[PDB]
Scaffold this active site. Structure first.
Site, PDB file in Angstrom:
ATOM      1  N   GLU A  42     -15.836   5.460  -3.199  1.00 29.53           N
ATOM      2  CA  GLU A  42     -17.154   6.084  -3.017  1.00 29.53           C
ATOM      3  C   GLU A  42     -17.140   7.579  -3.379  1.00 29.53           C
ATOM      4  O   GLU A  42     -18.014   8.060  -4.111  1.00 29.53           O
ATOM      5  CB  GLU A  42     -17.591   5.920  -1.569  1.00 29.53           C
ATOM      6  CG  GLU A  42     -17.962   4.489  -1.196  1.00 29.53           C
ATOM      7  CD  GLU A  42     -19.339   4.081  -1.724  1.00 29.53           C
ATOM      8  OE1 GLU A  42     -20.041   4.922  -2.341  1.00 29.53           O
ATOM      9  OE2 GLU A  42     -19.715   2.905  -1.518  1.00 29.53           O
ATOM     10  N   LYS A  84       3.038   3.175  -5.841  1.00 32.11           N
ATOM     11  CA  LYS A  84       2.560   2.183  -6.797  1.00 32.11           C
ATOM     12  C   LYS A  84       3.650   1.655  -7.733  1.00 32.11           C
ATOM     13  O   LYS A  84       3.712   0.454  -8.000  1.00 32.11           O
ATOM     14  CB  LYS A  84       1.396   2.697  -7.620  1.00 32.11           C
ATOM     15  CG  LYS A  84       0.205   3.212  -6.792  1.00 32.11           C
ATOM     16  CD  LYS A  84      -0.401   2.196  -5.859  1.00 32.11           C
ATOM     17  CE  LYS A  84      -1.336   2.867  -4.821  1.00 32.11           C
ATOM     18  NZ  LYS A  84      -0.838   2.823  -3.397  1.00 32.11           N
ATOM     19  N   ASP A 122      -3.153  -3.126  -2.716  1.00 34.84           N
ATOM     20  CA  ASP A 122      -4.292  -2.210  -2.796  1.00 34.84           C
ATOM     21  C   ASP A 122      -4.146  -1.230  -3.975  1.00 34.84           C
ATOM     22  O   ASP A 122      -3.029  -0.987  -4.461  1.00 34.84           O
ATOM     23  CB  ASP A 122      -4.424  -1.422  -1.477  1.00 34.84           C
ATOM     24  CG  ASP A 122      -5.854  -0.836  -1.257  1.00 34.84           C
ATOM     25  OD1 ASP A 122      -6.786  -1.003  -2.114  1.00 34.84           O
ATOM     26  OD2 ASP A 122      -6.002  -0.163  -0.224  1.00 34.84           O
ATOM     27  N   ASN A 123      -5.277  -0.722  -4.447  1.00 34.32           N
ATOM     28  CA  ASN A 123      -5.335   0.357  -5.473  1.00 34.32           C
ATOM     29  C   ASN A 123      -4.601  -0.061  -6.783  1.00 34.32           C
ATOM     30  O   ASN A 123      -3.865   0.736  -7.396  1.00 34.32           O
ATOM     31  CB  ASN A 123      -4.761   1.665  -4.927  1.00 34.32           C
ATOM     32  CG  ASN A 123      -5.488   2.189  -3.655  1.00 34.32           C
ATOM     33  OD1 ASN A 123      -4.856   2.375  -2.610  1.00 34.32           O
ATOM     34  ND2 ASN A 123      -6.794   2.445  -3.755  1.00 34.32           N
ATOM     35  N   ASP A 173       0.787  -1.192   0.000  1.00 32.58           N
ATOM     36  CA  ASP A 173       0.000   0.000   0.000  1.00 32.58           C
ATOM     37  C   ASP A 173       0.838   1.269   0.000  1.00 32.58           C
ATOM     38  O   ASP A 173       0.383   2.305   0.477  1.00 32.58           O
ATOM     39  CB  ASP A 173      -0.927  -0.022   1.232  1.00 32.58           C
ATOM     40  CG  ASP A 173      -2.090   0.958   1.131  1.00 32.58           C
ATOM     41  OD1 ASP A 173      -2.538   1.261   0.001  1.00 32.58           O
ATOM     42  OD2 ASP A 173      -2.535   1.425   2.215  1.00 32.58           O
TER      43      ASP A 173
END
Ligand SMILES: Cc1nc(COc2cccc(Cl)c2)sc1-c1ccn[nH]1
Length: 213
Positions: free
Chosen positions: A197, A142, A167-168, A139
């Site tokens: 969201e 990247k 993640d991501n 995390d």
């Protein structure tokens, strides 16, 4: 002041001392109501929770601590005797994360390591007494997911069954990482869709189980 210091003040003012659930709900509330943060998500949260419960890891490595949300999330689900090592490049985030864990009552399960993943990973066996890891949570930056995965392999830190959870992997995105693990007979991969969201976009996490060399 930093975003991380602001989130901690909100936790101290609103959450219940010694209650990891309350700390997570406070951080969720702040990030939804006041100031967005990329590392916080309740639905990314359910995915992390499900993976920790399925594999009951004894030793977890986390890359990137931030305000300590994900350390609180994982550490609260670890068994007595289990350990989370978390690496954090920014000394201010490392300090907030320790304070967050102390507030949550989870200090005895977590060791915070201050520095860059590529500097700390090759030191885990000699300096921190690691044989192999049961799970790794990626995390951090990247562009480093793939080199750090290759480094963990090369340093002998993964064993057959070690779970990587990244993640991501869709936004910002990690296409070199996903190509490598999904293409390699050294890994067995499962994708978990995850909605962001606030920005109203589909993201995801990748689970990659190491199969040995
Ligand atoms: C734990 C960690 N290691 C990183 C990579 O470290 C470096 C440091 C200098 C250059 C390069 Cl390419 C990489 S970024 C990072 C991080 C993100 C958020 N919290 N912690």
């Amino acid at each position: 002041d930093t975003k991380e210091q602001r989130i901690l003040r909100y936790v101290q003012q609103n959450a219940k001392p010694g209650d990891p659930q309350s700390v997570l709900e406070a951080i969720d509330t702040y990030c939804t109501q006041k100031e967005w943060a990329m590392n916080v998500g309740d639905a990314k949260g359910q995915i992390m929770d499900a993976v920790i419960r399925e594999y009951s890891p004894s030793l977890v490595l986390e890359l990137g601590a931030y305000c300590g949300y994900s350390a609180v999330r994982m550490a609260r689900l670890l068994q007595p005797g289990a350990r989370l090592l978390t690496m954090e490049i920014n000394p201010d985030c490392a300090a907030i994360t320790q304070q967050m864990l102390n507030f949550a009552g989870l200090q005895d399960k977590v060791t915070i390591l201050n520095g860059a993943s590529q500097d700390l990973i090759p030191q885990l066996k000699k300096k921190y007494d690691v044989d192999t890891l049961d799970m790794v949570f990626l995390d951090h930056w990247k562009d480093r997911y793939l080199p750090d995965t290759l480094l963990l392999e090369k340093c002998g830190l993964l064993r057959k069954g070690t779970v990587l959870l990244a993640d991501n992997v869709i936004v910002p995105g990690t296409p070199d990482f996903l190509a490598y693990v999904r293409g390699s007979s050294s890994f067995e991969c499962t994708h978990y869709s995850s909605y962001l969201e606030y920005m109203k976009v589909v993201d995801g996490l990748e689970k990659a189980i190491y199969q040995g060399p």
